[PDB]
């Protein structure tokens, strides 16, 4: 159902979707299971069609606060590659 | 916009039949 609103549902609308969900994840950090959940549904998206333009410097942490450690290695060492510090 | 990734899926599949300057 994501999937399906999502390819057609509009760019001003997807983009206060995004920033609705940033806060959903990052705010009133009470349950793991619903972070888990949207980092399961960022995880499809970006595994099969046109993932969310959500940046990996802020997706990455959200996979260390939730205990994410699989998650975290693979979307650290992209943002490693390119440029350390 | 949808425009943008039609547009960008179109030219790719006919460059993929395809396969100084000024």
Same mark, same amino acid.
């Given at each position: @159902?994501? @999937?399906?609103?999502?390819? %057609?549902?509009?760019? @001003?609308?997807? #983009? +206060?979707l995004?920033?609705? &969900?940033?806060?959903?994840? $990052?705010? $009133? %950090?009470?349950?793991? %299971?619903?972070?888990?959940? &949207?980092?399961?549904?960022? #995880?499809?998206?970006? /595994? +099969?069609?046109?993932?969310?333009?959500?940046?990996? /410097?802020? &997706?990455?942490?959200? =996979?260390?606060?939730? /205990?994410?450690?699989?998650? =975290? &290695?693979?979307?650290? %060492?992209v943002?490693?590659?390119? #440029?350390?510090? | 916009?949808?425009?943008?990734?039609?547009?960008?899926?179109?030219?790719?599949?006919?460059?993929?039949?395809?396969?100084?300057?000024?």
């Amino acid at each position: @159902s994501f @999937s399906s609103c999502w390819v %057609e549902l509009q760019t @001003s609308y997807q #983009e +206060d979707l995004i920033q609705a &969900l940033c806060k959903a994840l $990052s705010s $009133s %950090e009470n349950p793991p %299971e619903i972070y888990q959940m &949207l980092l399961n549904l960022v #995880e499809f998206m970006e /595994h +099969d069609d046109k993932p969310l333009p959500i940046p990996i /410097h802020t &997706l990455g942490k959200y =996979a260390q606060k939730c /205990h994410a450690f699989a998650k =975290a &290695l693979h979307y650290k %060492e992209v943002e490693f590659l390119e #440029e350390p510090k | 916009h949808p425009m943008r990734t039609s547009l960008a899926k179109l030219f790719q599949s006919l460059g993929f039949s395809e396969s100084s300057n000024t």
